[PDB]
Amino acid sequence: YAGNLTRPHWGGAASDVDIHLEVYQNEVDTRFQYQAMFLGLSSQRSVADRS
Amino acid sequence: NTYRIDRLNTSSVKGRTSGVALEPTPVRNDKMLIVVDTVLYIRNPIDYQDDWTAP
Numbered sequence: 799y800a801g802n803l804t805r806p807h808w809g810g811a812a813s814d815v816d817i818h819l820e821v822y823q824n825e826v827d828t829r830f831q832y833q834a835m836f837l838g839l840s841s842q843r844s845v846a847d848r849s
Numbered sequence: 850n851t852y853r854i855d856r857l858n859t860s861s862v863k864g865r866t867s868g869v870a871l872e873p874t875p876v877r878n879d880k881m882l883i884v885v886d887t888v889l890y891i892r893n894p895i896d897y898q899d900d901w902t903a904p
Binding site: 845846847848849 | 900903904
């Protein structure tokens with residue numbers, strides 16, 4: 799508080815009030831992944847390129 | 850797209866006696882053209898599902 803108001807506040811504006819600091823960003827979040835249950839509860843036969 | 854072949858005509862034999870002028874005759878000509886303007890084509894689209902369900 800000895801510095802009191804007089805302090806640089808790197809990342810301010812005018813009277814060092816506006817906070818416009820750079821934003822970090824790595825990844826995004828969305829709906830939760832769902833894994834098909836009936837892959838193991840159903841025989842998997844494939845007619846690929848025959849009929 | 851064009852192609853040119855020239856054409857040419859023939860003169861005719863004419864007779865003359867003593868003091869008669871030789872009448873000059875022209876030999877006409879022309880040209881012929883062949884122009885490509887049409888594209889023959891075959892267009893057979895096969896859907897994915899029919900491809901995946903047939904040889």
